[PDB]
Design a protein around this ligand. Structure first.
Ligand SMILES: Cc1cc2c(cc1C)N(C[C@H](O)[C@H](O)[C@H](O)COP(=O)(O)OP(=O)(O)OC[C@H]1O[C@@H](n3cnc4c(N)ncnc43)[C@H](O)[C@@H]1O)c1[nH]c(=O)[nH]c(=O)c1N2
Ligand SMILES: NC(=O)c1ccc[n+]([C@@H]2O[C@H](COP(=O)([O-])OP(=O)(O)OC[C@H]3O[C@@H](n4cnc5c(N)ncnc54)[C@H](OP(=O)(O)O)[C@@H]3O)[C@@H](O)[C@H]2O)c1
Ligand SMILES: [Mg+2]
Length: 309
């Protein structure tokens, strides 16, 4: 059955926390664990980081933490580094079900010369490698939380939520789905449909696949799960199989759900959105509908939720 969580007073706030800690006086949190999420054939390393905030930096699902990596702003001598934002991949109770930790899902940004393939560590991403290089007991400068675009609408506990992720864009949806299915939250009993679409390079690049597959067996009437493995599968048109191609496979069901009030969420690569728009336009055209008019209505009805970078 569902996992007991504490403390219940995390359900009492009527508004999400915002900017509890600011860049000039961050919260000094402590690393609990860092682990790789991926196998040896993944094109890059993605890690799962558990951070002890001690209850001092609570958040709601869908929000982000800021991390200030150590060192000096290169474009501003004497200044600290700029904040980098990370979508929180845990529920408000965290991976230890106690309200004391939050988790991040972090892709290592690594530079390769585009002609020779030669790596250059000096051009690697600062914060992402700082995080995935961290060890238990290391300190992390935390800011935030921030963000409201990806808060989960809970007014209707039987709503439908269609979740479209590329890579580490899966992060908020891990939190959504643990709250919907894993945790014993008496004041949110989800009875709708949650449908996760996840695009990653290959099987070794899957993120939290065991957890999501377990929801298929535990909640077969409330959860659906489809994967697009871009370097292991090809789409109808001959391109790499992307999430937009998986959406097209279920176009009629998805459009019916949207017409019925479903929420739809997009998180991950900003580059996926032009392809998704192109696919949805083509689907609409085949149905004899205008995607522009449909998208305008979805935005007006607050059904359309995008956070990409
Ligand atoms: C709201 C929101 C939420 C999230 C994210 C963004 C936003 C806006 N991101 C992205 C994250 O904030 C951050 O941008 C990345 O982790 C990269 O930051 P670094 O500090 O590692 O790279 P840094 O900012 O240092 O560098 C940026 C890029 O430039 C490259 N670069 C540096 N010097 C170069 C040079 N001389 N020539 C060419 N290239 C060079 C780096 O290799 C890197 O790819 C994210 N990410 C994630 O993995 N998980 C998440 O959950 C989220 N969540
Ligand atoms: N809240 C947020 O805004 C938020 C949260 C988390 C992450 N992000 C951003 O999302 C990024 C996710 O990157 P990642 O490194 O984890 O993923 P990645 O491995 O670069 O890509 C994930 C999958 O998306 C595919 N893809 C590439 N181009 C695409 C396109 N135009 N349309 C559809 N799919 C496409 C990739 O295929 P190929 O590589 O085979 O082309 C891969 O299969 C992060 O780097 C971060 O910048 C943003
Ligand atoms: Mg794996």
């Amino acid at each position: 059955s569902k996992v007991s969580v504490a403390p219940l007073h995390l359900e009492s706030a009527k508004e999400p926390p915002l900017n509890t800690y600011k860049p000039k006086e961050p919260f000094t949190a402590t690393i609990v664990s860092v682990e790789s999420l991926v196998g040896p054939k993944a094109p890059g390393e993605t890690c799962h980081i558990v951070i002890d905030h001690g209850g001092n930096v609570p958040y709601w699902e869908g929000q982000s933490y800021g991390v200030i990596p150590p060192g000096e702003n290169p474009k501003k001598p004497g200044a600290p580094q700029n904040v980098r934002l990370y979508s929180i991949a845990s529920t408000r109770y965290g991976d230890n079900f106690d309200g004391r930790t939050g988790s991040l899902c972090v892709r290592r940004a690594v530079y390769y010369d585009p002609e020779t393939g030669k790596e250059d560590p000096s051009k690697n991403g600062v914060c992402s490698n700082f995080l995935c290089n961290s060890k238990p007991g290391d300190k992390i400068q935390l800011t935030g939380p921030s963000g409201k675009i990806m808060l989960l609408p809970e007014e209707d506990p039987n709503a439908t939520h269609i979740m479209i992720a590329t890579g580490t864009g899966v992060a908020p949806f891990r939190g959504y789905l643990r709250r919907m299915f894993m945790e014993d939250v008496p004041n949110y009993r989800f009875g709708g449909l949650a449908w996760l679409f996840l695009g990653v390079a290959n099987s070794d690049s899957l993120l939290y696949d065991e957890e999501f597959t377990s929801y298929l067996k535990q909640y077969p009437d409330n959860f659906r799960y489809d994967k697009a493995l871009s370097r292991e599968q090809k789409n109808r048109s001959g391109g790499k199989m992307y999430v937009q191609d998986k959406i097209e496979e279920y176009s009629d069901e998805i459009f019916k759900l949207l017409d019925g009030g479903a929420h739809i969420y997009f998180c991950g690569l900003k580059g996926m959105m032009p392809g998704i728009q192109d696919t949805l336009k083509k689907v609409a055209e085949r149905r004899g509908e205008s995607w522009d008019q449909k998208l305008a209505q979805l935005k007006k009805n607050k059904q359309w939720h995008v956070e990409v970078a």
